[PDB]
Coordinates of C-alpha atoms and ligand atoms in Angstrom, one line a residue:
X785 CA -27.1 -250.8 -7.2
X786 CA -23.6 -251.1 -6.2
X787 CA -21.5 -251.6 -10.0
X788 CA -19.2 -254.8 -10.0
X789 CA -16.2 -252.8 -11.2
X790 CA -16.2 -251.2 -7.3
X791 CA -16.4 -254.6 -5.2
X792 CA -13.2 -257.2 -4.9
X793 CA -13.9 -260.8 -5.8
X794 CA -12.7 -263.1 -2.9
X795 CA -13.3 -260.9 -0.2
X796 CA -16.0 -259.0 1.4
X797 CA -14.5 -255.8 0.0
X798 CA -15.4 -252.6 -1.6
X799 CA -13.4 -249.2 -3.0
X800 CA -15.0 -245.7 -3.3
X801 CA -18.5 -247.3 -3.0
X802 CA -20.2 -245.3 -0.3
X803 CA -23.5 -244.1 -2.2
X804 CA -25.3 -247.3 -2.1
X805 CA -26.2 -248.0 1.2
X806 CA -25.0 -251.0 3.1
X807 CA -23.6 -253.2 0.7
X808 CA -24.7 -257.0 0.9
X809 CA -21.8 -258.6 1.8
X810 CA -19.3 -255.8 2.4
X811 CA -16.9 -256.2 5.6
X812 CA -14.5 -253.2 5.2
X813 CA -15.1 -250.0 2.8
X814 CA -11.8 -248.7 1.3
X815 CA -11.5 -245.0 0.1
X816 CA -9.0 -244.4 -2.5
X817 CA -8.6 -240.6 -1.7
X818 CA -10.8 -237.4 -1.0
X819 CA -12.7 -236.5 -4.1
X820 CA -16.4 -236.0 -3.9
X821 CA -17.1 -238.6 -6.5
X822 CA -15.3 -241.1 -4.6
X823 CA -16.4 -240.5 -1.0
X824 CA -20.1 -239.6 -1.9
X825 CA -22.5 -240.9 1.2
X826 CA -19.7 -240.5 4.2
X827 CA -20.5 -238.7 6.8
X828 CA -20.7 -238.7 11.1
X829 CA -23.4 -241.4 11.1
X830 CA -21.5 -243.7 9.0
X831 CA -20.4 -246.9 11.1
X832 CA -18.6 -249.3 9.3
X833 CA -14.8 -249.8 8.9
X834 CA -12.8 -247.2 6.5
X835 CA -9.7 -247.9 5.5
X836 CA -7.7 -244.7 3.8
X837 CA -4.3 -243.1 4.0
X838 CA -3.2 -241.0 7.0
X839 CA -4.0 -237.8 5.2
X840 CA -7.5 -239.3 3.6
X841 CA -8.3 -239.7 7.1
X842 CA -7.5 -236.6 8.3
X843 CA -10.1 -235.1 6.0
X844 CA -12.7 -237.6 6.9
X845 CA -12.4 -236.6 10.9
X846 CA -12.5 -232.8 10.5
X847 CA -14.5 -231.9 7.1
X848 CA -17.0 -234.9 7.1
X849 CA -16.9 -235.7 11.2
X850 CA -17.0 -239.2 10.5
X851 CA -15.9 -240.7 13.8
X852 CA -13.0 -241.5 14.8
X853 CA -13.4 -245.3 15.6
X854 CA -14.9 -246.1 12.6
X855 CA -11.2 -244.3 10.4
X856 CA -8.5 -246.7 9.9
X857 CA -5.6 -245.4 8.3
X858 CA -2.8 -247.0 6.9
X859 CA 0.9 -246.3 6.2
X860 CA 1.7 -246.5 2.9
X861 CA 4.5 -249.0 1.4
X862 CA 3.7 -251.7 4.2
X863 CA 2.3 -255.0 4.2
X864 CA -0.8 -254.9 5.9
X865 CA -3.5 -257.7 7.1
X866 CA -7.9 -256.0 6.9
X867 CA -10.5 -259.1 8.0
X868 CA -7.7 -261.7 6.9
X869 CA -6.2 -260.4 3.6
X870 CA -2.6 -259.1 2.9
X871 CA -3.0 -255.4 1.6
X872 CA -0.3 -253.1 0.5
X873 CA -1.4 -249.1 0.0
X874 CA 0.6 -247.3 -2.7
X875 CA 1.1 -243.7 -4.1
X876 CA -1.2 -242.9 -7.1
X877 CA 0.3 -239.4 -8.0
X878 CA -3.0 -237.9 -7.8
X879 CA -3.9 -235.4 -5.0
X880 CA -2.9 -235.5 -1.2
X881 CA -3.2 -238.6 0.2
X882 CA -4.5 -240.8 -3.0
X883 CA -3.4 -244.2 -2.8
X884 CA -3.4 -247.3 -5.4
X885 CA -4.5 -250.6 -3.4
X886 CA -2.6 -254.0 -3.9
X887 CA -5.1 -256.8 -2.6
X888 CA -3.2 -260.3 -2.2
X889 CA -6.2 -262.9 -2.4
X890 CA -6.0 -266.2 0.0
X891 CA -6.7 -267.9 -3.8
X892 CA -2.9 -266.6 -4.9
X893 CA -4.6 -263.9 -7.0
X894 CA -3.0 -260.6 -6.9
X895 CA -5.3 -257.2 -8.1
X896 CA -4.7 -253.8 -8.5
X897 CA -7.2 -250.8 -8.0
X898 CA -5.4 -247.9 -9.1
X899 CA -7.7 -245.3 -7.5
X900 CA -7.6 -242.2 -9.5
X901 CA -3.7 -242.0 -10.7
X902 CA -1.3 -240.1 -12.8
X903 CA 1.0 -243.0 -14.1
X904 CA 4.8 -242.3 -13.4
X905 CA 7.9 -244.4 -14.1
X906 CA 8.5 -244.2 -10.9
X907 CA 6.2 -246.7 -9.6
X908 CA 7.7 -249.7 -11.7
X909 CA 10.0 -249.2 -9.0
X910 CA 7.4 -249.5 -6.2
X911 CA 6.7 -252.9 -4.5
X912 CA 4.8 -253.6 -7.5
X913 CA 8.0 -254.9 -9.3
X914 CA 7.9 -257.9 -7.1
X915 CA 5.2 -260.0 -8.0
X916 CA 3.2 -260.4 -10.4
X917 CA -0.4 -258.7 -10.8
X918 CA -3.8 -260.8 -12.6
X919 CA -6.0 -258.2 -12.6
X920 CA -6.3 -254.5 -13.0
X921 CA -8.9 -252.1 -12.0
X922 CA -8.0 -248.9 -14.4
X923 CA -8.5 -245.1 -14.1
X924 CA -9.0 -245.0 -17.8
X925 CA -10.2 -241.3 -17.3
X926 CA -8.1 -240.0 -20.5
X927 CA -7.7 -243.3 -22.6
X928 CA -7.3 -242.0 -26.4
X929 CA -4.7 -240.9 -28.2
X930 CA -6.1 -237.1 -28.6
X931 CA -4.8 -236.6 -24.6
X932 CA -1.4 -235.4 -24.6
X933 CA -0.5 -233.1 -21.9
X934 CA 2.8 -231.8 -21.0
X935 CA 4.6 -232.7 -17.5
X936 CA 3.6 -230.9 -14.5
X937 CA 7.0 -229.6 -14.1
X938 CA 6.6 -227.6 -17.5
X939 CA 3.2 -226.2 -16.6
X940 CA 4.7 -224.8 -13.2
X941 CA 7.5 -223.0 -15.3
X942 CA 5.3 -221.9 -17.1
X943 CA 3.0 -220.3 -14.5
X944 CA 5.9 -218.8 -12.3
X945 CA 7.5 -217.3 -15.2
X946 CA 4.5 -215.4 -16.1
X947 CA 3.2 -214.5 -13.0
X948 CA 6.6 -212.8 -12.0
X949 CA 7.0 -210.5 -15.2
X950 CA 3.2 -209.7 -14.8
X951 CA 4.2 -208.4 -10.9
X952 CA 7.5 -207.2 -11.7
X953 CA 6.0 -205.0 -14.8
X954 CA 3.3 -203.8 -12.5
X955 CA 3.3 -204.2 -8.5
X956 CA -0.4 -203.3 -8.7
X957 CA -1.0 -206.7 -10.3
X958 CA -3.5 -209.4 -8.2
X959 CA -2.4 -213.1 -8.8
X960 CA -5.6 -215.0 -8.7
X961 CA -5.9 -218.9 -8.6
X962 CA -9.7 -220.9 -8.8
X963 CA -10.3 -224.4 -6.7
X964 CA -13.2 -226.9 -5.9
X965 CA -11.4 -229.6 -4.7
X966 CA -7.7 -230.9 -3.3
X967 CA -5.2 -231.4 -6.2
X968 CA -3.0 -229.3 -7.6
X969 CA -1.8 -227.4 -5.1
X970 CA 1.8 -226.6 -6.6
X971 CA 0.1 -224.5 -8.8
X972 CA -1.0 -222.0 -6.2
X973 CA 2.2 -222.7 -3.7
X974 CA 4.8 -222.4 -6.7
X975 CA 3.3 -218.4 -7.7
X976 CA 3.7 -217.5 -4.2
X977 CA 6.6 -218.3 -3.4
X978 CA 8.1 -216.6 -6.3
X979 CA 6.4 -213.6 -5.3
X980 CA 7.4 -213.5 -1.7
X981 CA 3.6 -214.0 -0.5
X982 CA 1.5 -216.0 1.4
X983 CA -1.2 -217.3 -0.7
X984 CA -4.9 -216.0 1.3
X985 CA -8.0 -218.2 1.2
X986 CA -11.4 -218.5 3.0
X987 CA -11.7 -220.4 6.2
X988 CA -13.1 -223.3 4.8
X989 CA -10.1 -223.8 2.4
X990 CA -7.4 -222.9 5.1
X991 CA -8.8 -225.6 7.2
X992 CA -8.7 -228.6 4.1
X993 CA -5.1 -227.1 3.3
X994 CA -4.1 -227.5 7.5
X995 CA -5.0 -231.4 7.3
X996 CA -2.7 -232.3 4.3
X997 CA 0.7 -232.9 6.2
X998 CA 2.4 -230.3 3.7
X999 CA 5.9 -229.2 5.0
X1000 CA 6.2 -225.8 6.4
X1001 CA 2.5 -225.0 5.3
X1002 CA 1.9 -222.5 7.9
X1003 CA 5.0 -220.2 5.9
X1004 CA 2.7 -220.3 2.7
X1005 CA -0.6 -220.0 3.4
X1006 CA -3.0 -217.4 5.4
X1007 CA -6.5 -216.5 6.0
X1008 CA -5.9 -212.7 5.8
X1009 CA -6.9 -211.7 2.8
X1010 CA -5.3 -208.0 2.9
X1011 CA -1.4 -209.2 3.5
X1012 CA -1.6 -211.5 0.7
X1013 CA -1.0 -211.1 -3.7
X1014 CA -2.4 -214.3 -4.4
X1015 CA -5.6 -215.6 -3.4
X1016 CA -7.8 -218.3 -3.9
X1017 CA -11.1 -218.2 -5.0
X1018 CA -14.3 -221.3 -6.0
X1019 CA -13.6 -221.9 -9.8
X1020 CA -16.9 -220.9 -10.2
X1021 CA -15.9 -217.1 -9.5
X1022 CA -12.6 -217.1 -12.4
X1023 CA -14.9 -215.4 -15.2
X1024 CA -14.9 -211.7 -15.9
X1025 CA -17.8 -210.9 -14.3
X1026 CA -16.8 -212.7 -10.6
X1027 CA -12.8 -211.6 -11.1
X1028 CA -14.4 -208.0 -11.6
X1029 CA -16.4 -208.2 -8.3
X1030 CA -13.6 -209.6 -6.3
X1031 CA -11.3 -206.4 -7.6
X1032 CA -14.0 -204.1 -5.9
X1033 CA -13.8 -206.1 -2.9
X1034 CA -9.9 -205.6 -2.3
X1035 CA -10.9 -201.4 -1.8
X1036 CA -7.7 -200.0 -4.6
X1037 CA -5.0 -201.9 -3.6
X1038 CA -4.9 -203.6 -7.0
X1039 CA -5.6 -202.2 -10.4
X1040 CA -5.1 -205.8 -12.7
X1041 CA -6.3 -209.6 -12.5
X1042 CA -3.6 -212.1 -13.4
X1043 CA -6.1 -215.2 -13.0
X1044 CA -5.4 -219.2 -13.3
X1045 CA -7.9 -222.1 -14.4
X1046 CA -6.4 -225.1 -13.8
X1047 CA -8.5 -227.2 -16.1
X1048 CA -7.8 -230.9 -16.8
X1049 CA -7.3 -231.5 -20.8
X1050 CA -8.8 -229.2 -23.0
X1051 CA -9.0 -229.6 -26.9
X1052 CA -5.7 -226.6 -27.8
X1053 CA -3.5 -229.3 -26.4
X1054 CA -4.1 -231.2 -30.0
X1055 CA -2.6 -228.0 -31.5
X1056 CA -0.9 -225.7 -28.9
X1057 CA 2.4 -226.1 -27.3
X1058 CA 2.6 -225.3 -23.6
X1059 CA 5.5 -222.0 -24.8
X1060 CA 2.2 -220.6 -27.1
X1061 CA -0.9 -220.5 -24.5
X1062 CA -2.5 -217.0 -24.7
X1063 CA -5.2 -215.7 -22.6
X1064 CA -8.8 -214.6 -22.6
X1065 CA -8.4 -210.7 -21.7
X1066 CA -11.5 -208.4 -20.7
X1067 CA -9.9 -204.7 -19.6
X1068 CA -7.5 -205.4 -17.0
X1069 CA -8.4 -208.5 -16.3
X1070 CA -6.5 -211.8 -18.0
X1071 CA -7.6 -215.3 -17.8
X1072 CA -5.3 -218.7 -18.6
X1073 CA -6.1 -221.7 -19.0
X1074 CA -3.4 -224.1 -17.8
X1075 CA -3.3 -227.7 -18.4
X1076 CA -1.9 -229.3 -15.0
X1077 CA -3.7 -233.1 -15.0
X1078 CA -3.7 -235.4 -11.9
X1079 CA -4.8 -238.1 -14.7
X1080 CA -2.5 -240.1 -16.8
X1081 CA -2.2 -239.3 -20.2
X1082 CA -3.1 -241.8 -23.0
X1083 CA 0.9 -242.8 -23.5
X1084 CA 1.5 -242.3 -19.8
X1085 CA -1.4 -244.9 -19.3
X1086 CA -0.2 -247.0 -22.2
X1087 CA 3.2 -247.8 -21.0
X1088 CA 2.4 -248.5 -17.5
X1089 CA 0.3 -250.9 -18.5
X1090 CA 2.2 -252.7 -21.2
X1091 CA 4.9 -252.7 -17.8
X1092 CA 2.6 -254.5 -15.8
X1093 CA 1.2 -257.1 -18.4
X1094 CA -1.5 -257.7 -16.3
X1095 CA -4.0 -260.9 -17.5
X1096 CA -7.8 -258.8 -17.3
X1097 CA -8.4 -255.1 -17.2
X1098 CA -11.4 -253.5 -15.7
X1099 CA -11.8 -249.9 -16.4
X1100 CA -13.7 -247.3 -13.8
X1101 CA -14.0 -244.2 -15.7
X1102 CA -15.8 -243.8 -18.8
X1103 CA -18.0 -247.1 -18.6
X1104 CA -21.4 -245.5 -19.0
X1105 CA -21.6 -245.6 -23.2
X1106 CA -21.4 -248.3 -24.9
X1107 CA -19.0 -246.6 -27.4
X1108 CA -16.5 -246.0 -24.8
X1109 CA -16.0 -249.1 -23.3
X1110 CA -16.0 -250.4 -26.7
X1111 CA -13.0 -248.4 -27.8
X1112 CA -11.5 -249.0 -24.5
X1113 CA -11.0 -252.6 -25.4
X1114 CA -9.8 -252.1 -28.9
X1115 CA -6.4 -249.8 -26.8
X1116 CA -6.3 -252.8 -24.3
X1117 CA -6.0 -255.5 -27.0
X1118 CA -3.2 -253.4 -29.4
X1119 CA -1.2 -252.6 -26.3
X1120 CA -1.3 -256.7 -25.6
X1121 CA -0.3 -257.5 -28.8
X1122 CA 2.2 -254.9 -29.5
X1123 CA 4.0 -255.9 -26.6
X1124 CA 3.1 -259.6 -26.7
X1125 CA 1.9 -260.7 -23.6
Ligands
NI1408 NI1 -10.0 -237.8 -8.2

C-alpha cells in the first residue's frame, strides 16, 4: 500500500506515489522529477492531475504520452494555489527539472519534501529563508559520515583534463561516456566541448536530451554517430567486453577507449583523493570511475539541515531496515543538539 512518508497530512495530496493505484483520498499527484523510481505507474492511460516542473512535463508528454490535459506544470519560485493550498516549487540540484515542494497548510503548518536533492548553500537563500518550516520530508540517500564526495566542479576538471591529454597524445582516441537515466549531463557536454565535438547518441537518448530546455543544445549534441569523438552508450555496455564490441562497430577510425562511469559514491572515496583516481585498463581500452553525485553528501545534508531547524524529520530513502532508520535518528538528534534547536 501507499507508505505514509509519500502522502501530505492536511490535504488530499501525494509526491512520487504513482505505483499504487488510485490512492484513497488523493486529489492531485505531485512528481518531484523524472527518475524511474519516482514516476513508476505513469503512463497515456493515467487521468488524474500531475503537477511537475515545465521540464518534468515535457518528459511526461513525449517519452511516457501521458496526455496533455491531465500535465500541469508549474514555474518554479512562485506562489502557487492546487485544490486550495498555497504551493511554492523549488530547485533541488538534482537532475533537469527536479524540484523541492514547499506545501503551506490552511492549519499554518509549513512542510518540505525535498524530492531527491543535492543540498547547496545556495538555497538558504531561496524563498525558504522567509518562513519558517515544521516538518521535513528528507532525501537521506547518503546519510553517514563514510560519504564524502568532492564538488561537482572538481570532478569536471578532472574529466576534461584527462580527456584532452588522452586526444591530444593520440587523435585515434574514442571518448566514451555510459547513461540510464537524466542527470549528470555536464559530464558528457564538458568532454565535448573541450574536444571540439558534438557528443553522438542513439535516437532514443537524443530525443530525452531535446526536451530538457538546455541552451544551445542543438550545438552539442547529434545522432550521427560517425562525425562525433564522444558517444554515449547504456551503462550496461562500459565493461571490456561491450567497449570492445562497440570499437568494431566504428569500422578503424579509432584505435583506443577513453571510457567514463559516472557512479554515485563508491567505497575509494574513504581513501582516494579526486588528483589520485586510476583506471581499470584491459589493452587499449581504459575505464574510470568518477564520482559526480546528484545526492547530498553526509556534511552537505548535515548543515542544511541544522539551517533549517526544522521541528520533525521524515526520511524517504533508506527506510526499509530497521538498522537504518535507526541510525538515521541517532544523526538527526546530534545535529539538534549540537546546534540547539
Ligand atoms: Ni533521483
Amino acid at each position: 500500500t501507499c507508505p505514509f512518508y509519500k502522502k501530505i497530512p492536511g490535504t488530499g495530496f501525494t509526491v512520487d506515489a504513482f505505483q499504487y493505484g488510485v490512492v484513497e483520498g488523493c486529489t492531485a499527484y505531485f512528481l518531484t522529477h523524472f527518475h524511474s523510481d519516482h514516476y513508476a505507474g505513469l503512463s497515456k492511460h493515467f487521468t488524474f492531475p500531475v503537477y511537475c516542473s515545465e521540464i518534468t512535463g515535457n518528459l511526461l508528454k513525449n517519452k511516457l504520452h501521458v496526455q496533455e490535459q491531465y500535465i500541469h506544470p508549474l514555474p518554479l519560485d512562485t506562489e502557487c494555489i492546487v485544490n486550495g493550498v498555497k504551493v511554492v516549487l523549488l530547485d533541488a540540484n538534482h537532475c533537469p527539472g527536479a524540484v523541492m515542494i514547499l506545501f503551506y497548510l490552511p492549519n499554518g503548518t509549513v512542510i518540505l519534501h525535498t524530492g531527491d536533492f543535492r543540498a547547496d548553500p545556495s538555497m538558504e537563500r531561496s524563498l525558504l529563508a522567509d518562513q519558517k518550516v515544521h516538518m521535513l520530508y528528507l532525501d537521506t540517500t547518503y546519510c553517514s559520515p563514510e560519504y564524502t564526495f568532492p564538488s561537482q566542479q572538481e570532478v569536471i576538471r578532472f574529466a576534461i583534463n584527462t580527456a584532452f591529454e588522452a586526444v591530444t597524445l593520440n587523435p585515434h582516441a574514442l571518448v566514451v561516456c555510459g547513461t540510464y537515466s537524466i542527470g549528470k549531463e555536464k559530464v558528457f557536454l564538458a568532454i565535448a566541448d573541450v574536444l571540439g565535438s558534438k557528443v553522438g547518441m542513439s535516437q532514443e537518448k537524443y530525443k530525452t536530451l531535446q526536451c530538457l530546455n538546455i541552451p544551445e543544445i542543438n550545438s552539442l549534441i547529434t545522432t550521427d554517430m560517425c562525425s562525433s569523438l564522444v558517444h554515449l552508450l547504456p551503462m550496461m555496455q562500459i565493461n571490456f567486453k561491450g567497449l570492445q564490441s562497440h570499437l568494431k562497430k566504428c569500422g578503424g577510425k579509432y584505435n583506443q577507449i577513453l571510457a567514463f562511469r559516472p557512479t554515485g559514491w563508491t567505497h575509494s572515496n574513504k581513501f582516494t583523493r579526486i588528483a589520485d583516481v586510476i583506471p581499470q585498463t584491459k589493452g587499449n581500452i581504459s575505464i574510470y570511475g568518477i564520482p559526480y553525485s546528484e545526492h547530498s553528501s553526509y556534511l552537505e545534508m548535515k548543515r542544511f539541515v541544522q539551517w533549517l531547524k526544522p521541528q520533525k524529520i521524515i526520511p524517504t530513502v533508506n527506510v526499509g531496515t530497521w538498522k537504518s532508520r535507526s541510525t538515521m535518528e541517532k544523526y538527526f538528534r546530534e545535529w539538534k543538539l549540537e546546534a540547539g534547536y
